[PDB]
């Protein structure tokens, strides 16, 4: 309200391609967490519920990163069989 306008969350359109500009803006707002923030703010999430989801999200991210690391490590041996017939 007190800030300058047309700087925050502003994307310029190139060659009249408004679809690509809108996708870029939506990608920016998504990566910065504003889209999820807006949605969670439509109804009040109670503090005990916010902590539960934040705890669930943090444990799921760790579990997925740890499961990705394991598969990357165990995919080194996905090469062809060196001792076929034995």
């Amino acid at each position: 309200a007190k800030h300058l306008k047309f700087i925050a969350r502003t994307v310029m359109v190139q060659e009249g391609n408004v679809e690509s500009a809108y996708r870029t803006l939506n990608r920016i707002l998504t990566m910065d967490g504003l889209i999820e923030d807006i949605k969670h703010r439509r109804y009040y999430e109670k503090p005990c519920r916010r902590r539960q989801r934040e705890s669930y999200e943090r444990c799921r991210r760790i579990y997925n990163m740890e499961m990705a690391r394991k598969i990357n490590f165990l995919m080194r041996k996905n090469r062809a069989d060196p001792w076929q017939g034995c």
């Binding site: 870029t24 803006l25 109804y43 009040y44």
Partner: protein, 137 residues
Amino acid sequence: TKFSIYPPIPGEESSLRWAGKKFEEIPIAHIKASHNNTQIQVVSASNEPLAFASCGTEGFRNAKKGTGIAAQTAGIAAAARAKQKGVIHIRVVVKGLGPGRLSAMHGLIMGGLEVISITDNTPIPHXGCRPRKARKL
């Protein structure tokens, strides 16, 4: 020169022009995309209103207002009244995640207006008023 998605900063010397007008002089299309309606107001750089259209003023009622085709129709209506007043290039400022968020912009284009930039001004309180309680569905 390479294309910059960052808008030109006022007071600096840019080479970009639209019909001989600088970015600071292009009129603004304000799109409020609500969950049950979409409102579009086109204003000049001096904040002079030029055109207003919403799904309700285009003859849509109740749940039909909260549709993309209703917002697209509202955009076409606002574009027509704005084009008569001399508007070609507009800066789009959309607030809200309603169904007419993108469709309202398409209608502005189909109505003869050229969008040079898109700005999101969806209100996000930094801590603000308590929203209504969750719904049991």
